[PDB]
């Protein structure tokens, strides 16, 4: 009576798209961030030492980050 019929265009398609977008980013938003969290809180990054006396390293063991 007091509240008339407001006329909004449509909302269902837009809310469906944003629901699908947040759900299908949230599907791998939680595990990837949790995995990189577990990496930089458990396995540790690296340490600052040099090449020892007469020794050959690999082409890795040059990089601070372990996933790198």
């Amino acid at each position: 009576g007091k509240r008339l019929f407001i006329i909004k265009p449509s909302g269902f398609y837009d809310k469906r798209f944003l629901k699908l977008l947040r759900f299908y980013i949230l599907l791998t938003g939680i595990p990837v961030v949790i995995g990189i969290t577990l990496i930089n809180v458990f396995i540790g990054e690296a340490e600052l030492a040099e090449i020892p006396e007469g020794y050959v390293p690999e082409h890795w063991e040059y990089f601070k980050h372990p996933i790198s």
Binding site: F5, I7, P9, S10, F12
Partner: peptide
């Protein structure tokens, strides 16, 4: 901004038709 024309509103999902 709220002068949505009246030829519209047929293209709602029918759940919103169950609302009204």
């Amino acid at each position: 901004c709220y002068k949505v024309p009246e030829w519209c509103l047929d293209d709602w999902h029918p759940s919103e038709k169950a609302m009204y």
